[PDB]
Amino acid sequence: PLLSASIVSAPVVTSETYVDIPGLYLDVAKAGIRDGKLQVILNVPTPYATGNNFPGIYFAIATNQGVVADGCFTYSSKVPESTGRMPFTLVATIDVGSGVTFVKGQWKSVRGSAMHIDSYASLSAIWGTA
Amino acid sequence: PLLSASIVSAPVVTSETYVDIPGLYLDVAKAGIRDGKLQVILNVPTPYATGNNFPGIYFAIATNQGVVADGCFTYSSKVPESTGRMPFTLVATIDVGSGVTFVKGQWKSVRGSAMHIDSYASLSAIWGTA
Amino acid sequence: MPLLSASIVSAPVVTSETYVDIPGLYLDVAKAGIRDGKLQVILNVPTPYATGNNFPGIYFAIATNQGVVADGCFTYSSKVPESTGRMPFTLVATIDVGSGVTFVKGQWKSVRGSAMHIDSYASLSAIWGTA
Ligand SMILES: C[C@@H]1O[C@H](NC(=O)c2cccc(-c3ccccc3)c2)[C@@H](O)[C@H](O)[C@@H]1O
Ligand SMILES: C[C@@H]1O[C@H](NC(=O)c2cccc(-c3ccccc3)c2)[C@@H](O)[C@H](O)[C@@H]1O
Ligand SMILES: C[C@@H]1O[C@H](NC(=O)c2cccc(-c3ccccc3)c2)[C@@H](O)[C@H](O)[C@@H]1O
């Protein structure tokens, strides 16, 4: 039992709080998963951030109970000569029998960065047992 | 059933088109997979690129039908002081019942870059159902 | 369909010329009753950084009781980075349990004397299957 959602682009976003990346959503309930474990992979292979103060993006895996895992990339220069593509992957294993109905990908600005996904990205899950 | 192929190095390559990374090939047919879903992970943990115009590498997951997912890393300087190692992971979920016999890893130059893998890299797949 | 996972929210700062264990990134394959088959292992360190004076970086490894099965690194592209940016890292290996594997662990080693930092979420995961 394999869940997968993929996008080829997202709207540009700037946010001080975690907001949902449109299209990176897995309905666990719709697949009739009510117990057990999901290994979740948020894969954003070609993201970039724009800004004037060491830009970056915070990414999270979230369920109906909140954020379960988060991370980020940041550039190593204040004003990068060019905002290079910086691959990002996040892996978390969640318990469904806690009352999980959904899994989603979120993002949040680092230091006011504008966040960009303009190519393929994916949210995936494999089901198993404790 | 768990598919896996790993390499410890590849030849240096420059290409304006996607070409196959030698050794990163999964034979779905030989494994007797003709239906269902594969979650594929292309993992190139220690790549780098060389060039004079903001180097990088494009990576793709491809089947007998073509590319199903792609991404890249790029540096953030035109002529990096040193071409740092830039980890890359791509994840895609494919339908084997569409006529898939193989899954392979490909790469393509960014702006004429020379592409380097000189350490471990892997192409993996887990089979499941919808 | 057993799913193994270990996660941390931080580790101690480390400088090491040799691979050392990242505390908390450990999977007991035996205790889970796995004695045969294949594990697909993912080491995920999404927000690491390194500090140093000479193009800093970190080497990461997946290891078993038999030794290292896979390794990689990130490195910065400047000798003395203006700031040590967070550089996401993932390593994927598929191992055989029936060779005498009891455990899987995450390791790290300095690049050029770097100090190694994990101060946020990181994970070691495994999915069991067969050839
Ligand atoms: C923000 C810039 O984005 C550039 N990339 C593009 O503008 C671009 C244009 C067309 C296609 C793609 C692309 C294609 C396949 C997969 C991902 C991206 C990138 C990239 O090369 C630079 O280093 C920099 O990060
Ligand atoms: C291109 C350069 O490559 C260097 N890497 C090596 O020269 C090197 C030499 C021996 C072994 C390895 C290695 C070992 C394990 C896994 C990956 C690479 C790297 C690296 O330190 C620099 O920052 C830079 O990106
Ligand atoms: C070493 C620096 O680390 C900074 N990050 C932090 O200091 C920081 C502070 C509080 C929280 C977090 C964090 C939160 C969620 C996930 C990961 C990290 C980072 C980062 O923005 C910079 O670019 C740089 O790499």
Residue numbers in the entry:
A (entry chain B), B (entry chain A): 1 to 130
C (entry chain C): 0 to 130
What did the study's authors say about this model?
In this study, we evaluate the potential of synthetic fucosylamides as inhibitors of the two lectins LecB (P. aeruginosa) and BC2L-C-Nt (B. cenocepacia). LecB folds as a nine stranded antiparallel β-sandwich with a Greek key motif and two β-sheets composed of four and five strands, respectively. BC2L-C is a hexamer that displays a double sugar specificity: the LecB-like calcium-dependent C-terminal dimeric domain is specific for heptose/mannose, while the N-terminal trimeric domain BC2L-C-Nt is l-fucose-specific and binds histo-blood group oligosaccharides, such as the H-type 1 antigen. LecB from P. aeruginosa binds most compounds of this class in the nM range, whereas BC2L-C-Nt from B. cenocepacia has a more stringent specificity toward the aglycone of this class and additionally only has μM affinity for the best derivatives.
In particular, 1 (SPR KD = 330 μM) displayed an affinity comparable to that of 2. To solve the structure of BC2L-C-Nt in complex with 1 new cocrystallization conditions were found, consisting of 17% Peg10K, 100 mM sodium acetate, and 100 mM Bis-Tris at pH 5.5. The structure could be solved at 2.55 Å in space group H32 with 10 molecules in the asymmetric unit comprising 3 trimers and one protomer along the 3-fold axis where the trimer is obtained by applying symmetry. Electron density is clearly observed for the aglycone in all protomers, while in some protomers one of the two structural waters could not be modeled. The two benzene rings of 1 bind in the narrow cleft of BC2L-C-Nt through hydrophobic and van der Waals interactions. The two aromatic rings of 1 in the complex are not coplanar but form a dihedral angle of about 28°. This orientation allows the distal phenyl ring to burrow into the crevice, while the vicinal ring interacts with Tyr58 in a T-shaped π-stacking. Considering that, both, the benzamide 12 and the naphthylamide 11 have negligible affinity for BC2L-C-Nt, the hydrophobic interaction of the distal phenyl ring of 1 in the deepest section of the binding site may represent a major contribution to the binding affinity of this ligand. In particular, the analysis of the dihedral angle between the amide and the biphenyl group (O–C–CPh–Co-Ph) revealed a rotation of approximately 130°, with values of −160° in the BC2L-C-Nt complex and around −31° in the LecB complex. In BC2L-C-Nt, the binding site is found at the interface between two protomers and is more buried and extended than the site in LecB, which is shallower and solvent exposed.
